[PDB]
Design a protein around this ligand. Structure first.
Ligand SMILES: [Cl-]
Length: 316
């Protein structure tokens, strides 16, 4: 209670994530969970055609958002935490007012399931990837498609803007990770290696220098996209069948976090590539993980035999 009255070789750090809450309510597989940028909320999407909003710190159910006619594969937040965008099998994205639950815009243009979506940092744009093999860039304000990029020759598994919105990275079962100029629509670089497995996920690092890429040979890799080379490889998990989300955990220790088809959340040391924790609790494939913006909190979500989201917290 008073600072003066309190008493004062490096050893590797490991996190100590422990289960705090299980969030149930979806009636089919959960597909994606994302924390709001302001840290207050978690949004989840599901095969049940619903989005649900939950308290990030207490896991308290807040609301259900509905309107899509078929199941939903992804959801993402605007930078101000006020909007969501969702990507559905109904071939549309919808933009939602989080406070009201209302659909503000339906984004029509894709000719097959919409698989992945994200706002840019400005949040004037949304990027989407589809089974129709295209990446589309949309105007948030008008709902109009601004550009259709003939990006891939198979479904687009992920799309992500870099920290200033100047680049988009896309991935596909076609084996490619492609980097696009947001303004011009031109492909600036294609990351390719000899092994060339299907690419199931991609995301820029927070500092924008690296790209984390998941491939369906049970591997995650960290690319330096400027240098066009692989810096790090993370293995030990199972990933041959699904587009599982992975993350840079930056609030405490510097980790890579992923789901896995063995029903665990995996956490690796980014530099050493050693697995530092495996989180056991889910009863089906962990399709999605997300890391809280400011606290050492992970959200995880699982497929049809589980249908729950779990919140885990660590001291580091
Ligand atoms: Cl380290």
């Amino acid at each position: 209670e008073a600072a003066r009255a309190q008493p004062t070789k490096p050893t590797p750090v490991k996190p100590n994530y422990a289960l705090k809450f299980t969030l149930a309510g979806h009636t089919k597989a959960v597909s994606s969970v994302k924390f709001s940028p302001n840290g207050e909320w978690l949004a989840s999407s599901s095969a049940d055609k619903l989005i649900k909003i939950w308290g990030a710190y207490d896991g308290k159910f807040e609301k259900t958002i509905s309107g899509h006619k078929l199941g939903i594969s992804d959801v993402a937040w605007s930078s101000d935490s006020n909007l969501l965008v969702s990507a559905s099998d109904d071939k549309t994205l919808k933009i939602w007012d989080v406070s009201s639950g209302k659909c503000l815009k339906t984004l029509k243009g894709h000719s097959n399931y919409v698989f992945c979506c994200n706002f840019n940092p400005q949040s004037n744009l949304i990027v989407s990837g589809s089974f129709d093999e295209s990446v589309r860039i949309w105007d948030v304000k008008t709902g109009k498609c601004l550009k259709t990029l003939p990006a891939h020759s198979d479904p687009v598994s992920a799309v992500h803007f870099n920290r200033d919105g100047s680049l988009i990275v896309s991935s596909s079962y076609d084996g490619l990770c492609r980097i696009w100029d947001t303004a011009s629509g031109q492909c600036l670089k294609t990351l390719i290696d000899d092994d060339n497995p299907p690419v199931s996920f991609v995301k820029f690092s927070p500092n924008g220098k690296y790209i984390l890429a998941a491939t369906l040979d049970n591997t995650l890799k960290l690319w330096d996209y400027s240098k066009g080379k692989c810096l790090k490889t993370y293995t030990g998990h199972k990933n041959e069948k699904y587009c599982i989300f992975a993350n840079f955990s930056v609030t405490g220790g510097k980790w890579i976090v992923s789901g896995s088809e063995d029903n665990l959340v995996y956490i690796w040391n980014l530099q050493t590539k050693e697995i530092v924790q495996k989180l056991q609790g889910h009863t089906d494939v962990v399709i999605s993980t997300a890391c809280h913006p400011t606290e050492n909190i992970i959200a995880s979500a699982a497929l049809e035999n589980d249908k729950t989201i779990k919140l885990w917290k660590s001291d580091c």
